[PDB]
C-alpha cells in the first residue's frame, strides 16, 4: 500500500510513516483523511516538504470531496474528505 | 480585486457559506476561501456546504495547499478558489 | 490498515485480503474504492457477506463520495467514490 | 418500473442524467438507480452528477447494496434512491 490515512494520533507519526514509504522506493504516497483530520493530512504534507524533504518532492494532485454516510438505522450525515497524492522530483 | 474568505475560529461553519452567499449576491463572482492550521478542515466543509446549497451554481476551480511562517512557525494553509456560475 | 482499497487485480484477490483481516480478528474493515472499482468493492463485499461468511457479516455503513481531483498541471476531473464498513454480526 | 431506472452500460452518465431531470420536470419526485455488475459504478456516477447539479435540491433517500441470483449466477447490485426536495 501506498496510502497513508490519517487518523487521531500526533501528526509527526503520519509524516514518519510518509517518510517510511518513501525511503522504502515508494516513489508515489497518497496521504489521505476525512473530517477533522484533513487539516493534519495537508500538515503532513507541508512538514515532509519544508522540513524533511524540501525540495525533494511534489503534489502531484489534491482531491477534495464530500461523502453521504449511512448506517444501518438509514440515517445519513455528510463528512469532507481530502487525499494529496505526493511524488519524488 | 479578487476576494479572499478566511474562515475563522469565531464563526461556525453555516455563517461562512451565508457569507459567501450575500457575496455572490452583490455581483462577487468568485472567492478564495482560505483556511490555516485547523481551520484547513473548516475551510473545506464550507466549500462542501456551499457546494451542497448551489450544485452546479458554483465550481471548485483551484486548489492550493501551502506554508507561510509567522511569528517563525511554520503555519499550512489551503485555498479554494470558487466560481460563481451560470 | 483495517481497509481494503480496491484496484485493479481480479475480485478475489480483494475478497482474500478481507478474509485475512477478519480471520486475524479485526472487528471491523473498510472495503474502499475510486472511478470503476466502485463495483468491485461492492462485489467483493458481496462475495464475502453470501460465498464465505453466510449469517455472519453486517454492513455497517456506506459511505458514498465525490472528489474533484486537480492535478500540479491544471487538469481537473471529477470521480465518484465509496466506501464499505463491514463487521462480524 | 415507471420509478427504478437500471443504468446500463450503451449510456453514458450524461445520458441518465438527463433521463431523470426529464421525469423530474415532469413532476416524478423519486427514482431509484439500480446497477448492477459493471453498471454499479455507473449508478453512483449517476447519483453523484445529479447531486453535482441539483446539490440539496435532491437527497439520497437510501443506498442498499445486495445480490440478486440469474441462471443460478450471484451478481451484485447497488440500489440509490433519490428524492427532491422542495
Known amino acids: 500500500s501506498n496510502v497513508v490515512l490519517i487518523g487521531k494520533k500526533p501528526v509527526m507519526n503520519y509524516v514518519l510513516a510518509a517518510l517510511t514509504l518513501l525511503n522504502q522506493g515508494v516513489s508515489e504516497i497518497v496521504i489521505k483523511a476525512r473530517g477533522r483530520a484533513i487539516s493534519k493530512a495537508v500538515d503532513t504534507v507541508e512538514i515532509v516538504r519544508n522540513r524533511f524533504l524540501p525540495d525533494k518532492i511534489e503534489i502531484k494532485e489534491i482531491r477534495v470531496g464530500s461523502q453521504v454516510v449511512t448506517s444501518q438505522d438509514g440515517r445519513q450525515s455528510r463528512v469532507s474528505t481530502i487525499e494529496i497524492a505526493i511524488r519524488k522530483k | ?86
Not at chain 2, 465550481?59 to 511562517?69: C, P
Open chain 2, 1 to 86: 480585486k479578487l476576494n479572499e474568505i478566511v474562515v475563522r475560529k469565531t464563526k461556525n461553519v453555516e455563517d461562512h457559506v451565508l457569507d459567501v452567499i450575500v457575496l455572490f449576491n452583490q455581483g462577487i463572482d468568485e472567492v478564495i476561501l482560505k483556511g490555516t492550521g485547523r481551520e484547513i478542515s473548516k475551510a473545506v466543509d464550507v466549500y462542501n456546504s456551499l457546494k451542497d446549497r448551489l450544485g452546479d451554481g458554483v465550481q471548485l476551480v483551484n486548489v492550493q495547499t501551502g506554508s507561510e511562517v509567522r511569528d517563525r512557525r511554520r503555519i499550512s494553509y489551503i485555498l479554494l478558489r470558487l466560481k460563481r456560475v451560470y
